[PDB]
């Protein structure tokens, strides 16, 4: 699969907890970035919010937080995690919520699930359409082509509460994208062992392709390297 559904969606949080992803830390850094650019910020929209881990922590920093997510199964986990937030089922390429926000964020390389400049431009225009004029757009990109490592293998095992999950991924270059194949073994005393597979195309947009998408949406763009996952961060300001 490629749609973050079913068993894969239910394993997502445990797998990334096992890999060391710290959403509390990332949310605090993201909130500080937002407050640096929009010092009276009060509202945030997290696009491709997945299971809602960032939003759960951002709600402490901003009086209104909302989310948008394409996968119904991810969205169901996010809604249970964030019962008091308004979350939306929808597509970052075309959504329309009828309000604006101090910040529009798109984290953890979700933007790489778009194919081609036309989809990238359309998403960035939607983000610009949802940001207040004194607000900020934040996009965590995928790897740039010059930084991509073909043949990369990641392997990790986590156990929690009687469930053991092992995850192995392999990445290769496929045209202008990463082809990443992911396999899971899920095990437990009563349930036995189950095997699951995922296969994704994640687009290797160049730095200049990202900057063009921000520019076409009317945002001034800046790239900061490092960031939450080693891939840096883009910030866009209206005007």
Ligand X SMILES: Nc1ncnc2c1ncn2[C@@H]1O[C@H](CSCC[C@H](N)C(=O)O)[C@@H](O)[C@H]1O
Ligand Y SMILES: Cc1cn([C@H]2C[C@H](O)[C@@H](COP(=O)(O)OP(=O)(O)Oc3ccccc3)O2)c(=O)[nH]c1=O
Cα separation values, 50 from 64, 76, 118, 150, 208, Å:
18, 9, 23, 26, 27
Task: Identify which of residues 136 and 190 has a Cβ nearer to ligand X in the complex.
Answer: 136
Minimum CB separation of residue 1 from ligand X in Å reads 11
Partner in contact with 146, chosen from a second copy, ligand Y, ligand X, none, beta carbon below 5 to 8 Å by kind: none
Q: Looking at residues 125 to 154 of the shown chain, list those that interact with ligand Y (rule: CB under 6 A).
A: 143, 147-149, 152, 154
DSSP reduced 3-state for 8: helix
68 to 107: interface string for ligand Y, x by CB under 6 A: ----------------------------------------
* Least distance in angstroms from the C-beta of 40 to ligand X: 25
Q: How far is the CB of 163 from a second copy (least distance, A)?
A: 9
Residue placing its CB nearer to ligand Y in the complex, 89 or 179: 179
Binding positions for ligand X, rule: CB under 6 A: 4, 48-50, 53-54, 68-71, 74, 91-93, 107-108, 110, 113
Mention every residue, 6+ apart, whose C-beta is less than 8 A from residue 52: 46, 67, 77, 78, 79, 81, 82, 85, 87
Q: Enumerate residues 6+ apart whose C-beta is below 8 A from 183.
A: 167, 168, 169, 195, 196, 197, 198
7, 174, 181, 222: which one binds a second copy (CB under 8 A): 181
Helix, coil or strand: residue 45: strand
Closer CB to ligand Y, 148 or 223, in the complex: 148
CA-closest candidate to residue 112, choices 239, 229, 5:
229
Compute the C-alpha angle 153/149/201, nearest 5°. Answer: 80
> What is the full DSSP assignment across 219-238?
EEEEEESSTTTSS-EEEEEE
| In the complex, minimum distance from the CB of residue 205 to ligand X, in angstroms, rounded to a whole number | 14
From 1-9, 33-41, 71-79, 156-164, span contacting a second copy (CB under 8 A): 156-164
Asked if residue 178 binds ligand Y (CB under 6 A), the reply is yes
- Binds 48: which of ligand Y, ligand X, a second copy, none (CB < 5-8 Å by kind): ligand X
| Cα(87)–Cα(183) distance, integer angstroms | 29
């Amino acid at each position: 699969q490629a749609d973050f559904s079913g068993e894969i969606a239910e394993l997502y949080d445990l797998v990334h907890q096992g890999k060391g992803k710290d959403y509390h830390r990332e949310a605090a850094d993201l909130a500080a970035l937002v407050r640096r650019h929009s010092p009276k910020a009060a509202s945030l929209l997290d696009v491709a919010c997945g299971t809602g881990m960032h939003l759960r922590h951002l709600a402490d920093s901003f009086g209104t937080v909302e989310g948008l997510e394409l996968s119904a199964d991810m969205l169901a986990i996010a809604r249970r995690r964030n019962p008091d937030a308004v979350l939306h089922h929808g597509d970052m390429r075309d959504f329309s919520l009828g309000r604006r926000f101090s910040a529009v964020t798109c984290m953890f390389s979700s933007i790489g699930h778009l194919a081609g400049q036309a989809e990238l431009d359309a998403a960035l225009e939607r983000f610009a359409a949802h940001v207040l004029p004194d607000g900020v757009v934040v996009v965590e990109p995928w790897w740039f082509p010059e930084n991509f490592t073909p043949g990369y293998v990641a392997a990790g095992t986590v156990e929690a509460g009687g469930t053991t999950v092992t995850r192995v991924s392999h990445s290769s270059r496929e045209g202008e994208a990463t082809r990443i194949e992911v396999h899971y073994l899920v095990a437990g005393p009563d349930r036995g062992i189950t095997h699951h597979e995922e296969s994704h195309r994640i687009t290797l947009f160049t730095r200049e392709q990202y900057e063009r998408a921000f520019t076409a949406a009317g945002l001034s763009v800046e790239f900061m390297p490092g960031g939450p996952s080693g891939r840096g961060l883009f910030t866009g300001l209206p005007g």
